[PDB]
């Protein structure tokens, strides 16, 4: 049964660290696996690093050819003891979700799976400890939450970017779209993942931002000098697999040629795609031209920019993002006489509690932004539907319009990641950042004679600058944060709708344990992305301040039937998460733009005056509660 | 008895990283232990830094305090709960060491207390996790030898500079001389302790030199400038204690000032110093001049340079020393933002592995340098030993005058350092340079009547420099290493003196292990200093090279009448050592002064020019043996 | 030329006059302004690696060997086997050497004006290489001979990728095999890659019979003595790799002249004529090599045997 099935997958996820040891006579026998076992066990993945990425495409298409699930299982099995723990776990994932007969199927938790990336090493050193220290069967407890000198007003932050369930959802988004992705090989593609790719990223940066107004900060700067120095940042986390760590940058470093790369090749890249944007076209490898056409263009950017294997001339517009995270990430010892491990900008499971990555993703957000620059703006026609008007809309909560946000704290259990020995639990206790719930009354009247069907799309914006309260449209296109997407049908005369926080479209409603999942439930049965992907909910809205900052709230209705497209999909799989997931093995539920209609240049000094009619801002308050 | 007495304090040894979590209601009970507990128990502790000292000092004394022995171990027990552990193992093995009351007992182990500063981030992890991989009482055994690519040159001397044997030495002998030390407190003074302290650390030094030489590479270079850059280092250290590790250093940036101090604080004081050797007195606090008097000279230069509690005016001339450790240690995170542990250079322990060590080390050894350099050189007078002549000197190995130095494996026992658990034990391997025993056969001549009593003075110098073959004895003096010091009595007519590597003044000849100390010897027992001290056997002599480099030896003899000192002391105690170490409780037995004739400059452009009559240099050959 | 300009040789002009970039105190430029003195300066190996590395970029964009263009089937080679005083090992020391000013600078009275300079040298060798003809006629090989060092800077490491960089060309050359057990010996002072002799303006006065062709005659070929690297008293490990081609395909058909300045072929290539080589310079090392040691790049028409080079103090 899939139950069963579950319980298998279960399995070749523990004790990754230990399945090492190889116990194999011969990898000839393994004609399959002859690809790999090239990056050994101990060391550090790269999820970034082009060869890492070689040798884990070769991962991914054994165990997608593999015959049956029982042969998948097969050859999963085998070669995470011979090809390495750290690499296989990656391989094994990402061709566990998407190989057809694996269905019904999540995936071990990642923080869960390596509790030592969510976890401080003094609390994963504790809890070790206090397993040793006496012997028994009684459970072990840790606070992580420490006592320390808090000199730099970047830890302010560490809500954000430490987190959780951010660093969980940013390991499983690459592993729904790999880099490495051929279609050809799969057979099937993943629908505009370039341009996916970009608005994830960017909107990972715009909730950045809105934490920082939050904490009376200004918006982070793009890392656009390549000379510039970068500030230090010491992560405290351990692999547990080894002694290592993930080594932690200093004050002050300027930039570093790698063996792999030099800085100026990056540089190089960076101004001919900015070029092929001007140009309006960009070359491929057949030396044809390609429009930067209104509809493709930011896919295409996409792929080049990160870049894919879909880029239409990886050779020569290089992969910039993706070094960008390499040569960051090893900035302590770019030449590798040391031999140190790399920072954590070098896994996606960990990049984000680094600063550096803000910096790093606007710039590469701007790229995207001068290609969006060179499109028109939005005319009327485009945004507004007629006969449908928005009243108001308002915000209800324990105080009406004024969301309340406040500390929560939670325990991570080790067990299933690092060698629990006796004891029956180890749990790590965190705190983490969670509003109360709330829910949205829109009044909309149809003046139209039938019914019609609205798309209500919900973005949050702050209403104050660092200068001081200033609504400029332009700048707000950053800062929005997209709250919610939903189909909506609405009937003659006056109607309200409501709709529940909890319902939201960016979030993921509930992510199973290994406890959940060794029982079997009915949430439904689908993949890596199951409980994983999503936006975590407790970061649905910012922090705010305890005085109540106050946010811009858009909610905008669209026509569905422009809106959807039409074909033959599945039966409700994983799309409450729509927003930045995207739906299972499906197109883009949404024909516009992402990130619409804040995507484009706004002409206005203020948000109001671009506003139709089947536009609305509620100014609502979000207070931190001490 | 003595046997019951080690027991005790073995035990105060023991888990001390657990010995944490305080289990006192309150301090003010203990009025005694009211000054110490200022530094929080996972901290890192400082040797060098002054507020650490500080503390130390503070808890010393309330052991040297303790009324008994009895008193002692209470203290010590409550003691240990509170006060952060590093500090706690300096202050009781300083006890431990003066305190009669402990006229019984060794210290246990650095190494096997602490296990994870001598062996590597990976056997460390290894062998833990071992001992939860597999429940079983069966031993775990890892070899830290590793694979590795090789990509500095300075790996090479990793064998002298990771060595277990001389950490531990540099460890105990600061602990034998601290830097702390009030001699009003104590009652009692160690003789020449200014002096000592310079003297240890120019033969590291000079030692160092001669293993880079046997090495084909250069000589050091001191820290003479400040601004200039380091080279990097990577302990690969995990310290057990924590999960974090010592910071690793990466390539170059000038230096950071620290909150403690600045670096136009630290030349300041170099010029001072400098300044005050040329003026040839130093100004005392009174504001009077104390001359820097041949005899005194470097004993105040060394109070004032580490410095130590001793330093005539600490506020002048500052600790230019101490600080170099400190400011070199948190040159990752000067302003403490990013929260990150010290690297080895902070450890008495560890230090000695980095690089760094040696450059700034011989910086301070150039000060001293100055001021040897403002005294006049030796005349024939003050060198010969009038009617003794040298003829000739052998040395008897398997092969004459040849040293054969090969690579031994040992094994560490961590269990005493480390939660144990399940297993009975666990040994990390690891592999240290050893050469052949050999002796020494030196036939003198006494013209004179009467029987003459000499003190045998032997040190051996490179035959070799960068350039080629050039026994310029003026560069030959930092060189020169010293072999052995011992006193002999010569009839008249010819004589023949054997003497063995084994018997060799400069070595520790043996370093009881915990297990060893379970039970109960009789070498005697005396403290810190035990087995501990003395520098490590294997590396009596430099690598060499498989080619068999060349090396001067050098031997004096000099009139023992003049050389002892007369006082009443000891029964046989702790002076196997005496050449580094000193003896306990006792002057220095050497009228000389320590180097001699080395520490003086020499006008003559050849070595062979220099020898007196009761000088010889035989030249040997030092070959490895891979 | 006006949208590329000249990379390499204005390199060699800015590093020549970096302590007069102005020209304002009237220096002389260094030794990298001319073709004669350039390589005694280490500048030169920095500039000259950095132009390699463009045409590397080049060659990268291409694709790698296959079996098919590599092998030349029914030919094996058995093994290769380097005679001197001791068999596999070369021996280096350096030689006494002197140059007569006299034609250069004003003699004056002095009939002869020598310099005494000393060089590297090594002792004379052959190889001996069995191979197999399976095949029933008669086949032309063309054997191409490289040495390459084993050492790296960490450990020994033949890793064919890095190799490619550092293998240096010992010798070309075409020999005819007849079916079953055959053993091609060549001395060392036949290589292709270097010159035999360059005469001297007394040996011109005089008149000789290499024959009579010119500015390369004795002059261009890399130098005999150089023809290996010095290596180390102790022996330094380098591979020795053989391979033999089908001479039917590496060589070009034409109509040229009669035996001239052919000798010194590798480097030089030949009077007058097209290069006689089909394959691209530096074949089979010019592409990337996937292999992880050298040995899995073999076919059954290449062999790697390990001599060892010592030097003599």
Redesign the interface.
């Known amino acids: 049964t899939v139950a069963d099935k579950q319980a298998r997958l279960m399995p070749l996820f523990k004790h990754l660290?230990?399945l090492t040891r190889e116990k194999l006579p011969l990898d000839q026998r393994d004609e399959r696996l002859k690809g790999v076992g090239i990056l050994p066990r101990?060391t550090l993945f790269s999820c970034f690093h082009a060869r890492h990425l070689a040798e884990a495409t070769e991962l991914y298409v054994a165990l997608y050819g593999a015959k049956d699930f029982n042969d998948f299982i097969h050859l999963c099995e085998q070669a995470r003891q011979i090809v390495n723990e750290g690499m296989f776990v990656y391989a094994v994932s990402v061709a566990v979700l998407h190989r057809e007969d694996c269905k019904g199927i999540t995936v071990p938790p990642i923080q869960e799976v390596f509790p030592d990336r969510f976890v401080?090493?003094?609390?994963?050193?504790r809890a070790?400890?206090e397993?040793?220290?006496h012997?028994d069967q009684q459970s072990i407890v840790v606070e992580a939450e420490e006592t320390?000198?808090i000199?730099?007003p970047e830890y302010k932050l560490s809500y954000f970017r430490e987190d959780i369930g951010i660093n969980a959802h940013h390991w499983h988004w690459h592993i729904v779209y790999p880099a490495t992705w051929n279609p050809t090989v799969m057979g099937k593609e993943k629908d505009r993942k370039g341009e996916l790719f970009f608005y994830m990223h960017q909107q990972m940066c715009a909730r950045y931002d809105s934490e920082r107004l939050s904490n009376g900060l200004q918006r982070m700067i793009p890392f656009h000098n390549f000379d510039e120095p970068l500030e230090?940042?010491?992560p405290?986390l351990?692999s547990?697999?080894?002694?290592?760590?993930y080594?932690?940058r200093?004050?002050?470093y300027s930039i570093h040629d790698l063996s792999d790369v030099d800085v100026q090749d990056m540089v190089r890249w960076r101004e001919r795609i900015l070029d092929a944007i001007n140009m309006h076209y960009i070359v491929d490898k057949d030396n044809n031209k390609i429009p930067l056409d209104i509809e493709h263009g930011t896919d295409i950017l996409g792929d080049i920019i990160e870049s894919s294997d879909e880029s239409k001339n990886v050779?020569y517009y290089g992969s910039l993002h993706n070094w960008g995270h390499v040569m960051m990430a090893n900035?302590?010892?770019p030449?590798?006489?040391?031999?140190?491990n790399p920072g954590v900008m070098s896994d996606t499971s960990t990049s984000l509690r680094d600063p550096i990555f803000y910096r790093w993703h606007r710039f590469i957000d701007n790229i995207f932004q001068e290609h969006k620059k060179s499109f028109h703006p939005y005319t009327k026609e485009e945004l507004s539907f007629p006969g449908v008007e928005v009243v108001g809309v308002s915000i209800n909560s324990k105080t009406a319009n004024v969301i309340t946000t406040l500390i929560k704290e939670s325990l991570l259990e080790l067990s299933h990641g690092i060698?629990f020995?006796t004891d029956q639990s180890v749990k790590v206790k965190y705190h983490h950042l969670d509003h109360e719930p709330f829910t949205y009354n829109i009044v909309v009247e149809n003046n139209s004679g039938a019914e019609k069907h609205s798309t209500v799309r919900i973005f949050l914006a702050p209403k104050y600058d660092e200068l001081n309260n200033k609504l400029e449209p332009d700048e707000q296109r950053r800062l929005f944060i997209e709250l919610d997407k939903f189909f909506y049908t609405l009937t003659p005369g006056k109607n309200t709708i409501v709709r529940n926080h909890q319902d939201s479209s960016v979030t993921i409603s509930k992510v199973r344990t290994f406890d959940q999942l060794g029982a079997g439930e009915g949430v439904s049965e689908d993949s890596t992305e199951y409980c994983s992907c999503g936006w975590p909910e407790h970061m649905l809205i910012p922090r705010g301040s305890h005085k109540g900052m106050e946010f811009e709230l858009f909610v905008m209705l669209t026509d569905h039937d422009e809106d959807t497209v039409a074909g033959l999909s599945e039966n409700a799989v994983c799309s409450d998460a729509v927003s930045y997931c995207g739906a299972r093995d499906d197109r883009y539920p949404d024909k516009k733009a992402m990130g619409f209609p804040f995507d484009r240049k706004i002409e206005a000094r203020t948000a109001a005056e671009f506003l139709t009619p089947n536009m609305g801002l509620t100014d609502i308050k979000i207070k931190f509660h001490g």
Chains 1, 2 share one sequence.
């Open positions: 660290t230990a101990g401080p090493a003094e609390t994963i050193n070790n400890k397993a040793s220290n012997p320390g000198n000199l730099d230090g940042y010491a405290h351990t547990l697999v080894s002694g290592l760590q080594a932690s200093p004050e002050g050779e900035i302590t010892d030449d590798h006489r040391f031999q140190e060698n020995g």
